[PDB]
Design a binder for this molecule. Sequence first.
Ligand SMILES: *[C@@H]1O[C@H](CO)[C@@H](O)[C@H](O)[C@H]1NC(C)=O
Ligand SMILES: *[C@@H]1O[C@H](CO)[C@@H](O)[C@H](O)[C@H]1NC(C)=O
Ligand SMILES: *[C@@H]1O[C@H](CO)[C@@H](O)[C@H](O)[C@H]1NC(C)=O
Ligand SMILES: *[C@@H]1O[C@H](CO)[C@@H](O)[C@H](O)[C@H]1NC(C)=O
Ligand SMILES: *[C@@H]1O[C@H](CO)[C@@H](O)[C@H](O)[C@H]1NC(C)=O
Ligand SMILES: *[C@@H]1O[C@H](CO)[C@@H](O)[C@H](O)[C@H]1NC(C)=O
Ligand SMILES: *[C@@H]1O[C@H](CO)[C@@H](O)[C@H](O)[C@H]1NC(C)=O
Ligand SMILES: *[C@@H]1O[C@H](CO)[C@@H](O)[C@H](O)[C@H]1NC(C)=O
Ligand SMILES: *[C@@H]1O[C@H](CO)[C@@H](O)[C@H](O)[C@H]1NC(C)=O
Lengths: 338, 338, 338, 338, 337
Amino acid sequence: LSPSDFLDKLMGRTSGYDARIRPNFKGPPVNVTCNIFINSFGSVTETTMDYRVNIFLRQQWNDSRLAYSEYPDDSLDLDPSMLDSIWKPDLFFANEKGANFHDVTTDNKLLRISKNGKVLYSIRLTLTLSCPMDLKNFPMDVQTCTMQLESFGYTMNDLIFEWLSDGPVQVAEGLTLPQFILKEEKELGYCTKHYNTGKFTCIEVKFHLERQMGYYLIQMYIPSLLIVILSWVSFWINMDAAPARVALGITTVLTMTTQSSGSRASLPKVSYVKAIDIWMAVCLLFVFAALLEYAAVNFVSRKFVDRAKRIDTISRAAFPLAFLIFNIFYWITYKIIR
Amino acid sequence: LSPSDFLDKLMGRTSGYDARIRPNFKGPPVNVTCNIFINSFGSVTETTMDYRVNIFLRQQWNDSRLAYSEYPDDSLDLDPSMLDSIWKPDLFFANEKGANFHDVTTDNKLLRISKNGKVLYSIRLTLTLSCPMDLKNFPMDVQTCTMQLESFGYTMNDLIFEWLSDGPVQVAEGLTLPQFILKEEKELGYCTKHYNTGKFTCIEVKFHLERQMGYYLIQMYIPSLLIVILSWVSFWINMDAAPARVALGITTVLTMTTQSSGSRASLPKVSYVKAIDIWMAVCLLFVFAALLEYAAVNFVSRKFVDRAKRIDTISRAAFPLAFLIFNIFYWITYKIIR
Amino acid sequence: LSPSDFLDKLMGRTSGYDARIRPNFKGPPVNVTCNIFINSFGSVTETTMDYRVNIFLRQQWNDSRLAYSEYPDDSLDLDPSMLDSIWKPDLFFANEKGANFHDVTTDNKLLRISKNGKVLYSIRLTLTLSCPMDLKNFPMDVQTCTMQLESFGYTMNDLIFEWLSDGPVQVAEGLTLPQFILKEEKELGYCTKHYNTGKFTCIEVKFHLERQMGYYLIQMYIPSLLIVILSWVSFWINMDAAPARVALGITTVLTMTTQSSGSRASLPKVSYVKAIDIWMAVCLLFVFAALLEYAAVNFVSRKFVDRAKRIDTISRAAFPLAFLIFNIFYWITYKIIR
Amino acid sequence: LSPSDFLDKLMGRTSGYDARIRPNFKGPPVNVTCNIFINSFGSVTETTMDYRVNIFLRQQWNDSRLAYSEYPDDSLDLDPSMLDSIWKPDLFFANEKGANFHDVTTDNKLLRISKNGKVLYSIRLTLTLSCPMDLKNFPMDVQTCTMQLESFGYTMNDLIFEWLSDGPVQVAEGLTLPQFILKEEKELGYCTKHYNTGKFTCIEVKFHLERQMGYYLIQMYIPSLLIVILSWVSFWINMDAAPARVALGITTVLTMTTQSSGSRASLPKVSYVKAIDIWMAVCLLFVFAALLEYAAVNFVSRKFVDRAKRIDTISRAAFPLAFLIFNIFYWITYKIIR
Amino acid sequence: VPANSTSNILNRLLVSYDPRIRPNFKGIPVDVVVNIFINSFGSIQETTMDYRVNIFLRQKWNDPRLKLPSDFRGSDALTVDPTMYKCLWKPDLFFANEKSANFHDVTQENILLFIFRDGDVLVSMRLSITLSCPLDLTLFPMDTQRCKMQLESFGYTTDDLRFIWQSGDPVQLEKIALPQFDIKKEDIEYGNCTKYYKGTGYYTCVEVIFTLRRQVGFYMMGVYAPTLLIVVLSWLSFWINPDASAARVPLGIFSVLSLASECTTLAAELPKVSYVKALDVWLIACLLFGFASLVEYAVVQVMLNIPTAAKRIDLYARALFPFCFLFFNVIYWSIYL
Ligand SMILES: *[C@@H]1O[C@H](CO)[C@@H](O)[C@H](O)[C@H]1NC(C)=O
Ligand SMILES: *[C@@H]1O[C@H](CO)[C@@H](O)[C@H](O)[C@H]1NC(C)=O
Ligand SMILES: *[C@@H]1O[C@H](CO)[C@@H](O)[C@H](O)[C@H]1NC(C)=O
Ligand SMILES: *[C@@H]1O[C@H](CO)[C@@H](O)[C@H](O)[C@H]1NC(C)=O
Ligand SMILES: *[C@@H]1O[C@H](CO)[C@@H](O)[C@H](O)[C@H]1NC(C)=O
Ligand SMILES: *[C@@H]1O[C@H](CO)[C@@H](O)[C@H](O)[C@H]1NC(C)=O
Ligand SMILES: *[C@@H]1O[C@H](CO)[C@@H](O)[C@H](O)[C@H]1NC(C)=O
Ligand SMILES: *[C@@H]1O[C@H](CO)[C@@H](O)[C@H](O)[C@H]1NC(C)=O
Ligand SMILES: *[C@@H]1O[C@H](CO)[C@@H](O)[C@H](O)[C@H]1NC(C)=O
């Protein structure tokens, strides 16, 4: 009668239940229809190659030992602290770096039970998962950050995970990201890892993260354009102002180097070229070419005024054109192809 | 009586109390009248999008099992160590990133029981809550950081939260924030989240944080203005000082770029533009136009000197005027729209 | 008689002691004579507004349930592990952010009992307390960082704290702070906070932290003085060399701005102005006025040439005088008046 | 007899051993011979004034209740899990800021026992000890960072520490430090702290750390030397080339200031001067005096140009001489004296 | 016979099992086999000299007290609820070159526990340890470091406990990717060190030595090519006419200052070390080259007070600076390949 004695007879001390034994011992495996509801997605640090999530994990399985008839209500809810007495499928995130629960006023968990023995195990988790990034096209990098569920103590012969059919993964209505644009497309794959000790099940969900061009543009693409335009207008200045144009080119080169160094500093040390670095290098080369143009002018000067002016105007009318066709190539290969 | 025996007969092993059971089981839900008392508010960092608070949470409810008559004292206080044996309603802060209690010389909890069974469970806490911010108008941003109280294990049919009528949210006498001006208008709303499982209750309080413009002003709006004034004084100089004016405009562009870079690096990457970014870029364009005007002067130098000086005077008379009207427009549209 | 059986009769299961009950229940409150022995003091960061301590906290109270006669030795020292069995008064530091014990080879504690029952419970701690600062005069500030020893569960009706008469607060022989010069006069007061739940007692101590000016001086004030003297020496040169003087003043302005930005970024964000900011702004204005002086010289020059020479002389002979009177005013009103 | 029964009879529940009571209760004190084995030394951050270590803290003593006759094996090793059931002497590191064990696959400890009862308790640790530094002679500093073992609960009448006769402190063959050079001479003495509670014992060991100047040299002494050499070469240039020497001196002063700011910032904010600051300031003054010399030249010139050439020659001949005698003074009195 | 009876009569306080006593007490030592699995590798911070690895530490031994009898044939192996790993005997084991090691408990202690018929045991436990490997940076951007992971024992001597690697395939790692370095799956050298701590006795230890071959990509892109551009700009400075006196010194000056700033940045990105780094060699060489351009202009100016001498100086410089720089670059790469 009393819920106290009821639980003591169902799974408590006087029940006979043994959490150290999985259901259907010496029998078929357990199917765990897992689903999650993300709550906070962010902290995507390209330097550490991680992304933090706070998820209301859920794990539903069917163990017959919890079949009852005293209480007629199908769905039943119990105290989280009732959890250490029943079985739980061993579950970890193979791509985790720093993970923890959340305990504030209680252990944030949920134990729900049905009349047919089916169970529901919802627990809160904060995961500093690890997704390696591809930065060949850095500002327009459509990445695929993963979340690899998997079993540790049990194998695929005794424990089989599998996503939920309808609405397996959800997100909070009202979410947003500062740098990225999370997509509704979320592919579901079976990693099903295999070690030497045994065959272990494993689930994976792949989030698509497209980095948007706003900040990187306004911070690194426009300043360099202005710097190269300064190096350009340095053309129309007279041919006798050597300190003028040389200091101009020097300052442009210095600020370009600092800009590129900062861009790299915000990112991890990587060998393969990054589009942003291509842009930094090409603009640096443009300002260096302007400096070399003035140097050629001053070398030809020592009637040479005519040839020097011809060079100056040819450059002032060509360099913009070449820079523009190059900008076309760059944006059309990094926004369309890649 | 031996008050130890009183406690043991009220809730101890001999009483018959089952903390694993919510009060009024299989009956009406529970009404938890929650209220808090803040003690520390700060660490508002837009880079991580969080603010750290210290609160004296409180949870008053009515459990019909803790009604007694032996001791006449209406309001009774007890030892926290016994607080673990009584029912504690589940509760978490959904928008939290990292939480923790504060145990120093004991566990910082409180238990106060009335005669009719009413309870008070006051506990200290520390929450690194999360509040997304809109920096479209950053130095004048009026943000709304929230605190979503909510239950996890129990549904809204078995656990209902709600603020207290009088004195629901308090603050410490003498509180003050470095960069912000906290307000006394604290909205109270019903988030009442609804996941797939069921209707989970949720309480939310919204703080309004009006950023003060002092530091950002004195650090970005004053020096940039001085730089623009340098680019201006580059006008009254005569043409013979070509290197003077070119180096001047160049250095001004450099320092403007560095100012923008730092101001944005101290803040998170975001696509949408920020007023401070507007000022950075527009002062950059101003010094750029000053340098370009000098270049046009030196080019027209090749009778010509008359028109060159005319252009110089026209620029010296106009550019400050355009900058002034723009300064007006900007401060008006970013202190009137707010 | 035997020590094991003695402790068991005193507070063990054989005794009858209940740690869940304060002494003198349903009677007068407990008078706790709390005194602390600091061991380390530092980590004063204006960024987070905290300071880290390491104290041998001590709490002496008189409970009559621990009066023994088997051993005539008055003072008795026991095993820390026996602490949990006796009563303890709840306590916390209201102005703390992170607090931890020090468990190394044991739980660092002390338990010394006398014959009358006068208990002594010394515990080790490390506290990241909080003390908001007034930086209206930053390098020459006289701050007051505090430590609010206060109870949480028990009210002023059942637990009353009070400092010790002689030697309540000590300091380790040989202490010293890197940036500050701690004082020996430590003000003691009663905070005695009153929340809505009840009247919770609270004890306060106020530390006078006087910041010394050595570093800030040699790192910010002297460089700025040299920059302004650079702007000064920009005077003796003739007028025919524009690029020299203009580049000089430009670079002085820029390095002054960079110095001020760095200094402020080494400190928290604040609306009001800091003395260091006053000095930065004044030196900036001085170099800017040197540049404006050169500009007015160039204008007056293009017999006004003697006029420009007189301007240069008047500047070179007055600017240092104005700077000296300003230095006098600044230092005398920030070292005497404040 | 049986090993399990043997343990249960010696120190287990059925033995009769009381861990809460030190050996020789109400008798002569306990002599603890402590010795350590350092394993990883480093992380000496001058900003926090601490050095992190990792030691196999060992503690021997003699308690007669642990004498047996069934096992003739003199040295008997046991299971760490059995450690929690015997007596352990209270111990802590007074100069510690943050400490922790290392629990991996077990809680790393050791319990060895002799026939006479002599115990050995080897445990692993990781201590971020604190040593206040004297940076008056900063790059050549010879710092003495301590490790203060000490008791907290038991007085010097019930617990006495004392270093091991021979081989009290060891180091791992193959150890090395990046910044410092640990010595083999390690002082070993008593500190014997004395609080108001009583006379507590103490053991302190002091490592003499001698910083090596490679990094600081190659990073600050060579570049600043190059800067002053630039300010020197500015001499041989002709006098009519104002912008050359002016901009050169300017940029030299600016880079000197930048370097000195970086140096001062890498270390804590300290009042007393640091030799590195002496060097930065004197090099700054050298280049500033070179610029002042150029200015005096330009003032004297406008056969005053002959006197200007004389001044330039006198400067080119005297600057290196004075810089060299100062270099002598500096190195001789900061390396040979200290 | 239910399974609860099996687990009970096998390992619990309800049966005659004592975990505080290793197998073969006062007899033959324990031969512990071991085998690692590198799941994640990276987060190397040369400033602190550490590298983070998330692994599965597998260790199998023989415990005769655990003996699944032939009474039942359920399997030759057997898997048990991880919560029993704390009941039976676990061998003392610690990574010595460790600074921070934490388990990974999420929804359960991430622990395996197999058992066999003859008594063989196998336990795997996830770990994320922050080891330490003293780096050799005499040649930094091309170094070949050897970061190690030496298991050990603390509460058991070599006379009772004994570690040995797995005969075949002890370490494993699949699709491993690091941004900077590149592991060699073949150079996985492992051996014994058999620590001998004074005062206690001989203790066992088995070490893995990962050979990390850093690549020169990011550095070539960030510190090399910019300085090369700076130096060729310093060269360019020569082609200007010496009559300027203000259009030729700024190039060298700002080149010197930019190289000094690069040196500052590199020293602030890396740990402070006494010995010299090849990167600093290259950088100081480029700095001296800029300084040489500047003193070349100076010698020209002195020779200007003359035209033939100035032309000779400038031409000899334009022809000497690049050749010497190229010879230096050749020798530098041929030395620090
Ligand atoms: C688990 O699912 C498999 C197939 O997916 C099935 O063969 C097995 O019977 C299931 N286990 C149960 C129902 O306990
Ligand atoms: C558990 O019982 C339900 C009852 O219909 C059944 O549908 C389901 O297949 C069983 N197993 C699992 C894993 O849900
Ligand atoms: C709790 O409040 C709800 C209304 O929200 C209602 O069920 C009733 O007023 C309360 N039920 C109790 C106290 O059982
Ligand atoms: C508790 O009981 C009182 C009646 O004594 C009732 O009015 C109240 O709604 C109940 N619940 C709470 C939370 O007070
Ligand atoms: C404890 O006993 C002493 C004995 O003189 C008395 O003075 C004191 O008031 C009592 N209470 C406390 C809290 O010390
Ligand atoms: C505690 O102190 C209060 C005054 O602070 C006094 O009224 C009361 O009698 C004291 N109780 C004791 C010493 O037990
Ligand atoms: C501990 O050492 C002291 C040294 O003064 C000695 O007097 C005492 O007898 C010793 N106690 C022992 C060995 O139990
Ligand atoms: C313990 O017993 C040994 C037996 O020789 C004796 O030498 C020693 O002094 C005693 N005390 C200690 C601390 O070792
Ligand atoms: C490991 O190496 C040590 C040192 O040579 C040796 O004593 C030990 O026997 C070796 N291990 C095995 C299994 O041979």
